[PDB]
């Protein structure tokens, strides 16, 4: 979301993930550790 | 309050408390000897 | 996230951030950095399962604290006996 603001703020996308993840108020840790899971569920998703 | 419960709350800070009473110096060890 | 004692530590808030020579973490809409230590950071799990993570040690503020007391018991009660 930086840029919007003005300025474009480079970010890793699993950190914006886990931004994100917080601000639903969920803990990061969980997203780490199922990577895999969560890539693979929307890759299959965006198939659907 | 209504409902509350039964339960030991754990102090983190307790099992450090007591291995440095265990370990302080000589005491409890060689302190109490003589 | 970092690796300490084999464990992961996560950021409470801000981002960690390191231009090579040191690690901190900061707020994340301002460039304040910071020490990292235990109150900064949470643990959650082992290193292995992360991607990405690297290696740092992580200071604890209780630590020289409970050290500046051992200096005086553990070394001045040492010979009277
Ligand atoms: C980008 O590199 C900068 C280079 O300075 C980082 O500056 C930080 O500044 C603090 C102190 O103001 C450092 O903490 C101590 O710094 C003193 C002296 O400061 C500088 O010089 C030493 C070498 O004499 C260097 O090691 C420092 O890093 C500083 O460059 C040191 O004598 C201490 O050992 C201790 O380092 C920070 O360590 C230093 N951070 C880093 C990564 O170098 C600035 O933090 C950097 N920005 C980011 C986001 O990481
Ligand atoms: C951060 O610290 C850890 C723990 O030291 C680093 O792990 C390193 O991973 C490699 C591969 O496992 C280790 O090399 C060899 O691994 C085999 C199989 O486990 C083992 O039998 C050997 O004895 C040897 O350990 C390596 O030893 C291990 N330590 C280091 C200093 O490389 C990790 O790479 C470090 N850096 C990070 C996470 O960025």
């Given at each position: 979301?930086?840029?919007?603001?003005?300025?474009?703020?480079?970010?890793?996308?699993?950190m914006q993930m886990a931004y994100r993840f917080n601000?639903?108020?969920?803990?990061?840790?969980?997203?780490?550790?199922?990577?895999?899971?969560?890539?693979?569920?929307?890759?299959?998703?965006?198939?659907? | 309050?209504?409902?509350?419960?039964?339960?030991?709350?754990?102090?983190?800070?307790?099992p450090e408390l007591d291995s440095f009473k265990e370990?302080?110096?000589?005491?409890?060890?060689?302190?109490?000897?003589? | 996230?970092?690796?300490?004692?084999?464990?992961?530590?996560?950021?409470?808030?801000?981002v960690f951030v390191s231009n090579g020579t040191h690690?901190?973490?900061?707020?994340?809409?301002?460039?304040?950095?910071?020490?990292?230590?235990?109150?900064?950071?949470?643990?959650?799990?082992?290193?292995?399962?992360?991607?990405?993570?690297?290696?740092?040690?992580?200071?604890?503020?209780?630590?020289?604290?409970?050290?500046?007391?051992?200096?005086?018991?553990?070394?001045?009660?040492?010979?009277?006996?």
């Amino acid at each position: 979301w930086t840029f919007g603001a003005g300025a474009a703020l480079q970010i890793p996308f699993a950190m914006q993930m886990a931004y994100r993840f917080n601000g639903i108020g969920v803990t990061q840790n969980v997203l780490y550790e199922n990577q895999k899971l969560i890539a693979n569920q929307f890759n299959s998703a965006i198939g659907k | 309050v209504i409902g509350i419960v039964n339960n030991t709350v754990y102090d983190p800070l307790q099992p450090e408390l007591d291995s440095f009473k265990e370990e302080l110096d000589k005491y409890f060890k060689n302190h109490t000897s003589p | 996230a970092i690796c300490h004692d084999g464990k992961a530590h996560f950021p409470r808030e801000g981002v960690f951030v390191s231009n090579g020579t040191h690690w901190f973490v900061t707020q994340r809409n301002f460039y304040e950095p910071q020490i990292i230590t235990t109150d900064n950071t949470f643990v959650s799990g082992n290193c292995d399962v992360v991607i990405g993570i690297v290696n740092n040690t992580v200071y604890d503020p209780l630590q020289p604290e409970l050290d500046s007391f051992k200096e005086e018991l553990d070394k001045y009660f040492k010979n009277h006996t």
